[PDB]
Amino acid sequence: ACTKNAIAQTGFNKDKYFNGDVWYVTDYLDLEPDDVPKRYCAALAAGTASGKLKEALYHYDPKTQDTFYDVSELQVESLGKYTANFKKVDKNGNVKVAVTAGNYYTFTVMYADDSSALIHTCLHKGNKDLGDLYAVLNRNKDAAAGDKVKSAVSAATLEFSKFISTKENNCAYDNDSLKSLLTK
Ligand code: FDE
Ligand SMILES: [N]
């Protein structure tokens, strides 16, 4: 179960975050960490598409090759805090698993600037028991976490040393599919 009410960044700039571009997960912290593998690849694109706030996700397990995409129309709880009822789609947006009650995640943007971010996410999926998952994002898939985002990790009373890097997994991403999924 999730336990954190993450606080959104003061002065969060939604139009900059939700600009349609890709964010790569570079490091993550799962508070119930047999919930996610120690090796993993994820990325997202976030933007407004025909007036609707949307997020597209990509996950890839670099060892098993398990792959999936998702898209959601986000609902606003407060500035920087969203609820996302997801559908699993192929890379082209064709629905594999429709939106369903109880399949949603929340996310909170704790820190963002033009190039980096710290988010909290709480996933709910069927009768699974999942916990809080923080992620450091960058616009550049290879970027080491800088002082702005690391300071935000400390300000959340977390230790960056505990975050697991994605950098050594040979992750390669289909950026074109994340961007195009925003419309789907
Ligand atoms: C490492 C990592 C990182 C991440 C991130 C993320 C973000 C930012 C967001 C998210 C979300 C999500 N996820 Fe995530 N993630 C991860 C992981 C994961 C896993 C392992 C999974 C599977 C689960 C189950 O089913 O069991 C997921 C998962 C997930 C999901 C589900 C999808 C479907 O369709 O089913 C979702 C919605 N993820 N995510
Ligand atoms: N996740």
UniProtKB/Swiss-Prot annotation:
Its EC number is 1.7.6.1. Keywords: Disulfide bond, Heme, Iron, Metal-binding, Oxidoreductase, Secreted, Signal, Vasoactive, Vasodilator. Disulfide bonds join C2-C122, C41-C171. Changing L130R: Coordination of the heme iron center and inhibition of nitrite disproportionation. It catalyses: 3 nitrite + 2 H(+) = 2 nitric oxide + nitrate + H2O. This is Nitrophorin-4. Superposition of the structures of NP4 in the presence of ammonia or nitrite shows a conformational change of the protein upon NO(2)(-) binding.
